[PDB]
């Protein structure tokens, strides 16, 4: 999982 | 013989003390809710969580602190922080002992953690959005003892995040809210889905109450602060 994108 | 100080950290415990007070207090459950009677914005943190990436079936955790440090928790336990210089490293093992070192002159044993921190550095600033870009943190973040992640957690709807410092934020995936909570300022910075902030003194909301969306996330950051406990 990553945090919120671009 | 000497005693010395040793370490007993109660940040973790005075946090859950004062979740759970101000819990109890059902500060939703008011004839009238004066939410802004409990602000202070000078309990503003310092530090938090800005970006992180789960790369934990390879590698570890990586994250971005506010002040563009950068951290890796890696999958053995130990800990690597670039500072916001660009250069300058802290090592952090097992057992918490620090030790120091730079991206150019570091320990040959250091090495891939050393890429993999670069890695995730790369991908973070190529990638992903920084939370909390329209907050200005505490004054002197410089002067401040730099944090480091110590322990986190997802469950099915957020990310828990437990800062060395004794901080915790938690960060809900859906609707992109994140509450920082300070044990030592006994307060909490929400963070709404609009990206506005507003920070809060804890004994402050258990007088004043506060609307069902913060309160519903305290009683869920409380469960957090259990688990983290256990």
New interface residues.
Partial sequence: ?6 | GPLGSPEFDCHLSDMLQQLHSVNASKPSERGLVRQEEAEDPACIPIFWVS????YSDKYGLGYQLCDNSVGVLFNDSTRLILYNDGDSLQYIERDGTESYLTVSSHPNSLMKKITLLKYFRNYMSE???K?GANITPREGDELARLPYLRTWF?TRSA?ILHLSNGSVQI?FFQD?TKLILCPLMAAVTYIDEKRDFRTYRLSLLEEYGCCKELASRLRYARTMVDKLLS
Avoid: E, F, G, Y
Wanted: glycine share 0%.
């Fill in positions: 999982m990553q945090s919120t994108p671009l | 970006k992180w990436v789960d990638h992903l959005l939370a997802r990310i960060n992109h």
